[PDB]
Amino acid sequence: DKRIDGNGNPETREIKISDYDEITFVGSADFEYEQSDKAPYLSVTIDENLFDYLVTEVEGGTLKIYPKSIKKGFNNNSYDLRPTVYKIKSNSKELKELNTVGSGSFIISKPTKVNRMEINMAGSGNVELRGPVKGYKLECNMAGSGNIIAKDIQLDNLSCSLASSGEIEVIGTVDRASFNVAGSGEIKAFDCQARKAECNIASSGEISVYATQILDANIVGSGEIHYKGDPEISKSIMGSGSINKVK
Amino acid sequence: DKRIDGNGNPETREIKISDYDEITFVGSADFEYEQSDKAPYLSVTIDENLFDYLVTEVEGGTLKIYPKSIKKGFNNNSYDLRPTVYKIKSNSKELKELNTVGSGSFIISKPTKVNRMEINMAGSGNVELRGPVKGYKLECNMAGSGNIIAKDIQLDNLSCSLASSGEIEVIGTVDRASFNVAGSGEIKAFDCQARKAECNIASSGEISVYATQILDANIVGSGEIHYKGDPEISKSIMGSGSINKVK
Ligand SMILES: [Cl-]
Structure with missing residues (x-):
């Protein structure tokens, strides 16, 4: 059956x-x-x-x-x-919108011009934007243990939200970035150069961010924000978590 | 230090x-x-x-x-x-609002009359509303591996949102319920009699719900909704998840 x-x-x-x-x-x-x-x-x-x-x-x-x-x-x-x-x-x-669920792998390999692209993944699988992505807005949302990786972005706006234990990784340049983790997972964005970034963590997860001008760093829980660049940081921590600056 | x-x-x-x-x-x-x-x-x-x-x-x-x-x-x-x-x-x-973060334990034991009470927990600890809670609205939100239990509720509105792997358990009677899991965790509400309930799962979590008149059941992922009562159900599954009716 x-x-x-x-x-x-x-x-x-x-x-x-x-x-x-x-x-x-x-x-x-x-x-x-x-x-x-x-x-x-x-x-x-x-x-x-x-x-x-x-x-x-x-x-x-x-x-x-x-x-x-x-x-x-x-x-x-x-x-x-x-x-x-x-x-x-x-x-x-x-x-404009990808809704992917499962253990599969979804891959875009060529230069892609975007106005608004929204990626939504649930599960253990992967989405890989291997080609250069350039344009106005990319949104990467996931719930699960899998991962999304964008290898080469050039955007006005980037937004990533991660629920659960997985991983989002982004590499390139963006004007404004928003990074959100609710769970134990991890956003890796040290080689994604943002002018302004907002980072939010709920619970024990982790974000690595590179912001050049403004960084708004918020943690509710035991999680951690690691940042590089020399932005002006606004710090907010409720819990045992921590913020640290790296070279 | x-x-x-x-x-x-x-x-x-x-x-x-x-x-x-x-x-x-x-x-x-x-x-x-x-x-x-x-x-x-x-x-x-x-x-x-x-x-x-x-x-x-x-x-x-x-x-x-x-x-x-x-x-x-x-x-x-x-x-x-x-x-x-x-x-x-x-x-x-x-x-009106509790924000609790850590491994501790927050307990209310006496009969409690509420207008709107909102409980926000992050971490591995617990919140227990042990005494009878009666009134307009309760909202139980958590991110983490811990738990919230409300042992005796009588409410016009209940909203529970769970991120990560923990657990929310609710017992009593409510007119309108909203139950949301984003992660691998669980909402236990077989003993919370709702008239109308909305249930949303992202990824692999579970909800056990009791709705008497109307149930709106939504899964994106491999998660599961188990329901009792004889409501009119609206079903939406994107993924390998499932819905099942129990006695
Ligand atoms: Cl006073």
Whole structure:
């Protein structure tokens, strides 16, 4: 009933889709995405038997890829797919919002221009923005033990919120940054040069920040903010946590 | 410099205070609090040598009890106090807001009448509302591995928000409930009879809910909502999580 193992015969299907500006992706695939002015494109490779258990379509301008609800299960639960291979390649004109859930990996590799890009991840997986991202606003939100890494950003605005034990890492330059941890996890942003940054920690987590002009440093709990640069810092600590300046 | 051990000679001091409607409490004490129309009262018992390292005062209508910032440490950190005995007893006319951080224990035992009471905890400690709490609204918020238990509530509104791995447990009757978990933790409310409840999980946590008329059940991740009662349920799962009805 609930668990379906891949039969070991991988099949690739190109799926006809309209453009989309939003992705709902649930699962364990390696998903490669790019923004592109070419025609919108979707290809999925998985054990041939698992397609019958998977939704893969664009609807209402949203690409939706996830395991189906269990047949006669009243949408109380979905199938637990165990593929031997699971790869997704897709593109659209713009990605304003990614909602990803699971143990998979979502990767953007080419230079990406953004107006507002929002990344929302739940689970143990990973999102990697490997290519240069440049533009107005990037938001990286996660709840879980996995991670998000943006390797090369140039932004007016960056916002990261981490719930639970995972990790967000950001590298580049930003004018204004907001870093938030609620849990034991960690934001790593020493090589993300911010002019102004706000750092908030609830509980035992950690933020490493580089702010050049203004740093607003807030901790409620045992957590820690490590900072570099020579900003003017506003400090606020309720609990056993601590703030420290590093070279 | 940072860790100060109790010298094993307990001293009790009654500290003169004005009335307060808010508490900031950081540390490991057993703190007993009640609402009362008598004169405001504070008594603290701790190893005699640790008073010098402790702030204990009412300012701006807020009772503040927390370890001091390390002398000449620029408020980057505070003393790590290791008492052999640490007890606090206090009362004020009303408690609108508690902010508690640490491994301590904050207990209210008498019948308590509330308008709006908000409890904010960070850390591994606990808050117990042992006596009957009756009134308009209770809000229980925590970030950390500890717990909040309310043993006997009767409320128009209840809101509980849990970040990280800890636990909130609520027993009684409420008209409208909102239960939120962002993390691996748990809300236990099978014994809190709600008319309408909204339940939200991000990542792998759990909620046990009892709703009689209306239940709005939302999971993003692998978490689980278990419900009892016969409400009309609205279901939304994005991920491997599930919803299940129990007797
Ligand atoms: Cl007074």
